[PDB]
């Protein structure tokens, strides 16, 4: 059984400017199988309103999914993205970096 | 320029926990326009691009009716391969299929493709000539004999060389404002001190279309491709893409480094310095 | 427009 590991990128749709509407994206790619748990978090707690893209795959057949939610950045809020996959000995937590 | 239409189909078994899941998506170029999820409420093909919204019910009933057939087909297909591979009906397995056609600048047929993958691995694929198959293992060979038998690839060629291109051109004309555009990268650099003696130059290409782009860092003309960090091109979520490449530079040499960006929506490959 | 052909492995 083929199994790949998720790449995880946590970024904003537009350049982050405190006090302006934006979308917080979590893009997960390069993983197999497709069973993936992906959660967006704000200050260590699951954001409930969070859409996602339709499953699709690459030239290597590995899968990818965009997870996003509208949000407005502030100077003190910490945002992160939680991913679980079979290849993952345990969920992985990626904090959002403004310059990333 | 050249354009493409492609459909992707995924199909995962759910041993004991219901039917196999089935997800179909369709893109023109790097733009998704339709979807079908077997676990979605509607149980219809739904749109995802603005230009396909107004296509009439007849078109939707058609596409739904034929996606449902694909669904059911892949349902059988899962069963077939559990056989070929002598596998337990206890585990979960994936069938993936992709097909489509490319067209050139003249909007005339360029090439077509149609490929399967069992459990994230190559199974069988139509070859360039759109008449011959490539079986990756023994089970795939069997399917290949089965398909050469029913003249499968003659019917495919007729979809890929006609219906597919016929419809791609339609889409391209209907969604002209969208699909026929190219957005040049909106680029810029950021500088961060890794320490007292080191800085990280990061080169941004934001908000472009199509996804294909090239970001290289150079130092006094010499490609730094090995010391360059470079993330996957990623979706912005608005129909545009982003990407960046970073180098870790010695404070005082910011000037020796250039970032070069090449895209279809650019007349002259941009060059960026920290200067 | 999707393909109309039923295609089984």
Q: What would the 3-class secondary structure string for chain A be?
A: CCCECCEEEEEECCCCCCCCCEEEEEEEEEEECCCEEEEEEECCEECCCCEECCCEECCCCCEEEEEEEEECCCCCCCEEEEEEECCCCCCEEEECCCCC
Neighboring chain B residues of C5 at a CB cutoff of 8 Å: 152, 155-156, 159
Are residue B238 and residue B115 in the same domain, yes or no? no
DSSP string computed for B67-90: HHHHHHHHHHHHHHHHHHTT--TT
Q: How many CB atoms lie within 10 A of CB B136?
A: 17
Considering B181, B205, B233, which residue would you say is the last residue of a domain? B181
- Quick one: angle between helices B138-149 and B57-84, nearest 10? 130
Give chains near A: 3+ CB pairs under 8 A: B
Mutation target to probe the A interface, by most A beta carbons within 10 A, among B236, B243, B246, B248 is B236
Q: What are phi and psi of B117, to 5 degrees?
A: -145, 125
- What is the CATH number for B190? 2.60.40.10
> Do residues B60 and B172 share a domain?
yes
Is residue B101 within a helix (H) or strand (E), and if so which, with residue range?
Answer: strand B94-103
Same domain, B137 and B236: no
Question: What is the rounded distance in angstroms from the CA atom of residue B195 to the CA atom of residue B193?
Answer: 5
Judging contacts by C-beta atoms under 8 Å, the chain C residues touching residue B123 are: 9
Residue B5 falls within a domain, yes or no?
Answer: yes
Does the beta carbon of B131 lie under 8 angstroms from any beta carbon of chain A? no
Q: Do B266 and B260 form a contact (C-beta atoms < 8 A)?
A: no
Contact across the interface for B76 and C8, Cβ inside 8 Å: yes
Cβ atoms within 10 Å of B185's Cβ, excluding its own:
23
Same domain, B226 and B133: no
Mutate which of B10, B32, B121, B189 to test chain A, going by most A C-beta atoms within 10 A? Answer: B10
Identify whether B275 is part of a domain: no
CB contact under 8 Å between B94 and A32, yes or no, is: yes
How many beta carbons lie within 10 A of that of residue B254, not counting itself? 15
Taking the domains of chain A in order of start, what are their residue ranges?
2-99
CB-nearest to B234 from A15, A27, A61 is: A27
Contact B75, B96 (CB under 8 A): no
What secondary structure letter does DSSP report for B20? P
Fold of A2-99: Immunoglobulin-like (2.60.40)
DSSP type of residue B63: H
- Say if residue B142 is in the same domain as residue B7: yes
Q: Is B118 helix (H, G, I), strand (E, B) or coil?
A: strand
Option in B146, B147, B167 nearest C1 (CB) = B167
Question: Domain ends where: B125, B147, B181?
Answer: B181
Side-chain half-sphere CA neighbours of B199 within 13 A = 15
Looking at the structure, tell me whether residues B115 and B188 fall in a common domain.
Answer: no
Give the number of other CB atoms < 10 A from CB of residue B71: 20
CATH code of the domain covering residue B23: 3.30.500.10
Report helix, strand or coil for B54: coil
What's the rounded Cα separation, in Å, for the pair A8 and A19? 26
Count of domains for chain B: 2
Residues A62 and A4: beta-carbon distance below 8 Å: yes
Cross-strand pairs, A9? A27
A74, HSE (Cβ side, Cα atoms, 13 Å): 5
CA dist B178 and B231 (Å) reads 26
Distance CA A62, CA B185 (A): 27
Q: Exposed (0-12), middle (13-18) or buried (19+): which is B3, by Cβ within 10 Å?
A: buried
* Cβ neighbours for B152, distance < 8 A, ≥ 6 positions apart: C5, C7
Phi-psi region of A17 (alpha: psi -120 to 50; beta: other; left: phi over 0): beta
Asked if residue B77 is part of any domain, the answer here is yes
Nearest by Cα to B66 from B103, B26, B39, B32:
B26
Nearest beta carbon to residue B119 from set A2, A27, A56: A2
Find, among B7, B11, B14, the residue nearest to B22 by Cα: B11
Which pair of structure tokens corresponds to residue B121?
């691995």
Cβ pair C9:B80 closer than 8 A: yes
Q: CB B26 to CB C3 under 8 A?
A: no
Residues belonging to chain C: 9
Q: How many CB atoms lie within 10 A of CB B271?
A: 11
State whether B38 and B149 are in the same domain: yes
B63–C contact, CB cutoff 8 A:
yes
Domain that holds residue B263: 182-270
Residue A36 CA to residue B90 CA, distance in Å, equals 19
Cβ contact C–B (≥3 pairs, < 8 Å):
yes
Among the listed residues B91, B77, B89, B96, the one whose alpha carbon sits nearest the alpha carbon of residue B139:
B77
- Give the H or E element holding residue B263: strand B257-263
Residue whose pair of structure tokens reads 């339609």 in the numeric block: B170
What is the C-alpha to C-alpha distance for residues A18 and B177, in angstroms, rounded to an integer? Answer: 33
Cβ neighbours of residue A73 under 8 Å, at least 6 residues apart?
A12, A16, A17, A18, A19, A20, A22, A98
Helix (H, G, I), strand (E, B), or coil: what is residue B103? strand
B70: in domain: yes
d(CA B32, CA A55): 11
DSSP three-state, residue B100: strand
Q: Does B265 lie in the same domain as B172?
A: no
Q: Which two tokens stand for residue A33?
A: 């199988």
Query: Distance (Å, rounded) from C-alpha B125 to C-alpha B47?
Result: 28
HSE-up (13 A, CA, CB side) for residue B177: 4
Are both B186 and B165 inside the same structural domain?
no
Q: Could you tell me which of A16, A14, C4 has the C-alpha nearest to residue B156?
A: C4
DSSP classification of residue B2: -
Please give the C-alpha separations between residue B192 and each of A34, B188, B247, B255, in angstroms, as whole numbers: 36, 14, 11, 15
Indicate whether B42 and B136 sit together in one domain. Answer: yes
For residue B250, what is the DSSP state? E
Give DSSP secondary structure letters for B173-239: HHTHHHHT--BPPEEEEEEEESSSSEEEEEEEEEEEBSS-EEEEEEETTEE-TTSEEEPPPEE-SSS
- Residue A75, burial from CB neighbour count under 10 angstroms (0-12, 13-18, 19+): exposed
Resolution (A): 2.5
CA B264 to centroid of chain Cα atoms: 17
Distance of CA B141 to the CA centre of its chain: 27
Partner-chain contact A54 B35, CB within 8 Å: yes
Q: How far apart are CA A78 and CA A76, in angstroms?
A: 6
Q: Which residue of B has its CA nearest to A51?
A: B237
The whole-angstrom separation of Cα B66 and Cα B126 is 21
Q: Do B240 and B105 share a structural domain? A: no
B191 with B173, same domain?
no
Cβ within 8 Å of residue B117, ≥6 positions away: A61, B94, B95, B96, B97, B123
B155 assigned to some structural domain = yes
CB atoms within 10 A of CB B40: 12
């Amino acid at each position: 059984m083929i199994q790949r590991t998720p790449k995880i990128q946590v970024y904003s749709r537009h350049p982050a400017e405190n006090g302006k509407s934006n979308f917080l994206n979590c893009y997960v790619s390069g993983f197999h199988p497709s069973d993936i748990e992906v959660d967006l978090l704000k200050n260590g707690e699951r954001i409930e309103k969070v859409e996602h893209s339709d499953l699709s795959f690459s030239k290597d057949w590995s899968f990818y999914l965009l997870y996003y939610t509208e949000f407005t950045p502030t100077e003190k809020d910490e945002y992160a993205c939680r991913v679980n996959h079979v290849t993952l000995s345990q969920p992985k937590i990626v904090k959002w970096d403004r310059d990333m | 320029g050249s354009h493409s239409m492609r459909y992707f189909f995924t199909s995962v078994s759910r041993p004991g926990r219901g039917e196999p899941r089935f997800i179909a998506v369709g893109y023109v170029d790097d733009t998704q326009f339709v979807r079908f999820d077997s676990d979605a409420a509607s149980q219809r093909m739904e749109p995802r691009a603005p230009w396909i919204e107004q296509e009439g019910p007849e078109y939707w009933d058609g596409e739904t009716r034929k996606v449902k057939a694909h669904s059911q087909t892949h349902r059988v297909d899962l069963g077939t391969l559990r056989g070929y591979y002598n596998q337990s009906e206890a585990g979960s397995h994936t069938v993936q299929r992709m097909y489509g056609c490319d067209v050139g600048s003249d909007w005339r047929f360029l090439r077509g493709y149609h490929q399967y993958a069992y459990d994230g691995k190559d199974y069988i694929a139509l070859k360039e000539d759109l008449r011959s198959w490539t079986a990756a293992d023994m089970a795939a060979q069997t399917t290949k004999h089965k398909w050469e038998a029913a003249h499968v690839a003659e019917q495919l060629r007729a979809y890929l060389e006609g219906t597919c291109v016929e419809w791609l051109r339609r889409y391209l004309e209907n969604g002209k404002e969208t699909l026929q555009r190219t957005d040049a990268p909106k680029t810029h650099m950021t500088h961060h001190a890794v320490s007292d003696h080191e800085a990280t130059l990061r080169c941004w290409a934001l908000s472009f279309y199509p996804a294909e782009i090239t970001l290289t860092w150079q130092r006094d003309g010499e490609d730094q491709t090995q010391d360059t960090e470079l993330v996957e091109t990623r979706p912005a979520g608005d129909g545009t893409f982003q990407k960046w490449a970073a180098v870790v530079v010695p404070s005082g040499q910011e000037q020796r480094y250039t970032c070069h960006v090449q895209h279809e929506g650019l007349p002259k490959p941009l060059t960026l310095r920290w200067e | 427009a999707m393909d109309s052909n039923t295609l089984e492995l």
